[PDB]
Amino acid sequence: AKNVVLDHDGNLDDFVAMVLLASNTEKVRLIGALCTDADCFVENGFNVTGKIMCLMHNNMNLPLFPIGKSAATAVNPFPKEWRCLAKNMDDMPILNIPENVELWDKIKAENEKYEGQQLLADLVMNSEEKVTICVTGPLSNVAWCIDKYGEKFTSKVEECVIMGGAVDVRGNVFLPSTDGTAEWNIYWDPASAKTVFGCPGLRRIMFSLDSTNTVPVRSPYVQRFGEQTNFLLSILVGTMWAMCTHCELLRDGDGYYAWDALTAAYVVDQKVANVDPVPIDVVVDKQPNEGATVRTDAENYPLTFVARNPEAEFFLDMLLRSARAC
Amino acid sequence: AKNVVLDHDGNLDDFVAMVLLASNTEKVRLIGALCTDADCFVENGFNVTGKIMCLMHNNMNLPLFPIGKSAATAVNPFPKEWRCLAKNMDDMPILNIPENVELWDKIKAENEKYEGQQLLADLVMNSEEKVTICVTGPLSNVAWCIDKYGEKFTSKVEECVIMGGAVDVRGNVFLPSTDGTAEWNIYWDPASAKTVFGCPGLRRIMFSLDSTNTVPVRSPYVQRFGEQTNFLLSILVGTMWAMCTHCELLRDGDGYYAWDALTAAYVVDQKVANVDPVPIDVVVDKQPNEGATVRTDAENYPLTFVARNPEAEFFLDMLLRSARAC
Ligand SMILES: O=c1[nH]cnc2c(CN3C[C@H](O)[C@H](O)[C@H]3CO)c[nH]c12
Ligand SMILES: O=c1[nH]cnc2c(CN3C[C@H](O)[C@H](O)[C@H]3CO)c[nH]c12
Ligand SMILES: [Ca+2]
Ligand SMILES: [Ca+2]
Ligand SMILES: [Mg+2]
Ligand SMILES: [Mg+2]
């Protein structure tokens, strides 16, 4: 197995990503997680991370790992309605089984001490083998580590597998002030994304909307978790997906996708997608396309490996199988 | 046990109300249900009703009953975001267990043939013993039965226990062209509500916001369903409540309440609340208070028994216990 740190922001797919990483122990050793106050309220995202970890630890092969709240602050905050989802999950019966929340209350004090950005730096820098960072929220934490530690940090990163951006397709940030070309994780903190995408000697894999658009969360697939209710993880994953199957009803053709789950699936098994090198820059200016990830023809600019044409069925099967881990 | 029909509109508390009624076999014989296209999309609300019924049939010997979709149409439709919740529920693992879905698929076509309004009229009029109607959506269906059948229908109603209105407290319908004095179930179809509240020889119990304000859905209580994951009904009820606990974060002091559940609890046990007779009229004209339930001074105006001083703790315990039936 390879060392992985999950750098997430506590939406539903972030937690599915966590389940994927934590359940595939032969491929992934999940050595830590951090939660950013972006697409969640960080207190809730933190507690849900702990509750999921404890559920899994108490029912399967999963060493406990440190969980930190990131100090990162928004440039452009997420909509409040989207940030609420970790609050809902914090209250879900599946995440509040007595033995699991007992464990979480016992191990919480240690985890409360951490600051997520420093934790990310430490886990990466202090690991014997290189660490893969699975980034499923904004890029603020990776940028903070690059800024503070430079090559001392980046040399220890195997690769950074990032959910974010939109290269050859429209974005998903649709605000009166925006032109729709930006994707939300980048838009939340464009300057940090720019630092990450421009960093030489950091290997980056990018799951932009170009690839994640192929995995909308659809009812028939979600209902398959109902076939697996003997498994706690299937109740968990299926519940989280069931909470997003209406989004396409609200936003025609623009619902919820397994964005972060596909990203984590690639960390588990790179057969999830082939990747193409693209030099990626980020618009940081307060223009309508703030946060857009754009190709740059700048000489000697670092490459980012953009996922294309993912193996959607392989991914969907991986998740259904992984959710039978307990 | 007394005969009860549930006339609901497919939001989360509607389904908690259904569970409360159905699980209390000693007190309630649930002989039918109908779903209205009000605070849900009726196809989803219909399917969730069927899926809950089938779960309960297969796990606690609950007799099957007819389920109809009402043809009622909105005067003032609900916000689309609120109507989505039955979509989410339709996809929940707990409601998609194969044995239960197989049963629902087998029997759903027979239920699809009913007109919901006619089903309400027929179940009431054809019953050997009188029927209590628990109305947790708008009053359109009871009004239709009154308009079509008059005393032939109302004489067969034991009582109508209604979630709706706001008598001595503010409402919950807030837009620049309303004054916030109306409650949503009434506002959805004011004229139907007027027909029901003004109908002589119909016993009405009214759970207005005056009483339901005592039962906000809050995280600590909701998390107690986590103590009960050995019970399918607690996974179900707790999941539905967990989907509500953020609403107060979105609307300060104006979150989600156990509106319909408290109403159904009264059907199970009238000790849930005292009632006081009030003559209730409904504003139907295009006024800022369209949909408001007001005291009327009209001579000989029919009385409605408005719930007061509900036993909130008794209710909370009743629901936690009922959710342990299976
Ligand atoms: O509809 C939405 N509901 C919640 N969050 C979002 C995001 C942001 N996040 C969600 C995923 O966690 C992913 O990391 C990123 C996609 O832009 C984009 N649209 C929605
Ligand atoms: O915040 C809300 N989310 C969903 N629905 C509503 C209603 C309408 N319904 C909800 C209950 O089913 C109840 O019957 C009625 C209360 O006005 C009022 N506020 C909200
Ligand atoms: Ca995310
Ligand atoms: Ca209702
Ligand atoms: Mg165990
Ligand atoms: Mg007024």
Window 234-293 of B: residues touching A by CB (8 A cutoff) are 234-235, 238-239, 241-243, 245-246, 249-250
HEC per residue, chain A: CEEEEEEECCCHHHHHHHHHHHHCCCCEEEEEEEECCCCCCHHHHHHHHHHHHHHHHCCCCCCCCCEEECCCCCCCCCCHHHHCHHHHHHCCHHHCCHHHHHHHHHHHHHHHCCEHHHHHHHHHHHCCCCEEEEECCCCHHHHHHHHHHCHHHHCCEEEEEEECCCCCCCCCCCCCCCCCCCCHHHHHCHHHHHHHHCCCCCCEEEECHHHHCCCECCHHHHHHHHHHCCCHHHHHHHHHHHCCCCHHHHCCCCCCECHHHHHHHHHHCHHHCEEEEEEEEECCCCCCCCCCEEECCCCCCCEEEEEECCCHHHHHHHHHHHCCCC
**Interface mutation target, options B246, B252, B324, chain A, most CBs of A under 10 Å:** B246
With a 6 Å cutoff on the Cβ, whether B7 touches ligand 2 is: no
**CA B24, chain centre distance (Å):** 16
In chain B, the number of structural domains is: 1
SS (H, E, C) A64-91: CCCEEECCCCCCCCCCHHHHCHHHHHHC
Exactly one of B90, B122, B189, B260 is catalytic; which is it?
B260
Helix (H, G, I), strand (E, B) or coil at B157: strand
CATH of the domain at B291: 3.90.245.10
* Solved with: X-ray
A150: left (phi over 0), alpha (psi -120 to 50) or beta: left
Tally Cβ neighbours within 10 Å of residue B269. 15
- Greatest distance between any 2 Cα atoms in chain B: 57
User: Could you count the other beta carbons within 10 Å of the beta carbon of residue B168?
Assistant: 11
What span, in angstroms and rounded, lies between the C-alpha atoms of A284 and A293? 10
Instruction: Tally C-beta pairs within 8 A across A and B.
Output: 114
- End-to-end alpha-carbon separation of chain B, Å? 19
Measured at the CA of A147, the angle between CA A142 and CA A148, to 5 degrees, comes to 100
The encoded tokens of residue A73 equal 């602050």
Q: What distance in Å separates the CA atoms of residue B249 and residue A80, rounded to the nearest whole number?
A: 9
Q: Residue B243 — φ and ψ, nearest 5°? A: -80, 0
**Residue A303 belongs to what domain range?**
1-326
Which residues, listed in sequence order, are joined to residue B5 by a DSSP beta bridge? B32, B133
Name the burial class of residue A202, with classes exposed (0-12), middle (13-18) and buried (19+) by CB atoms within 10 angstroms of its CB.
buried
Give resolution, Å, one decimal.
1.3
Q: To the nearest 5 percent, what fractions of chain B are helix, strand and coil?
A: 45, 15, 35
Instruction: Nearest chain A residue to B218 by CA: give it.
Output: A91
Beta bridge partners of B157: B131
CA of A184 to the centre of ligand 1 (A): 7
Ligand 1, atom 3, lies closest to the CA of A82
Nearest CA in chain A to B96: A226
Minimum-distance ligand 1 atom for the alpha carbon of A14: 12
Tokens of A47: 């507690």
Q: What is the distance between the alpha carbons of residues B35 and B47, in angstroms, rounded to a whole number?
A: 10
For Cα atoms A258, A263, A266, give the angle at the middle one, nearest 5 degrees: 125
Nearest CA to ligand 1 atom 8: A184
A207 in Cβ contact with A307 (< 8 Å) = yes
| A147 is an active site residue | no
Measured CA to CA, the distance from residue A157 to residue A76 in angstroms comes to 27
How far, in Å, CA of A111 to CA of A65, rounded? 9
Sheet holding A293-295, edge to edge: A67-69, A28-35, A2-8, A131-135, A157-163, A204-207, A303-308, A274-282, A293-295
Helix (H) or strand (E) holding B90: helix B85-90
Q: Are strands A293-295 and B303-308 parallel, antiparallel or unpaired?
A: unpaired
Tokens of A284: 């940081």
B260 lines ligand 2 (CB under 6 A): yes
Distance B212 CA to ligand 6 centre (A): 21
Query: Which residue's alpha carbon is at the smallest distance from atom 5 of ligand 1?
Result: A82
Chain B neighbours among A 285-314 (CB < 8 Å)?
none
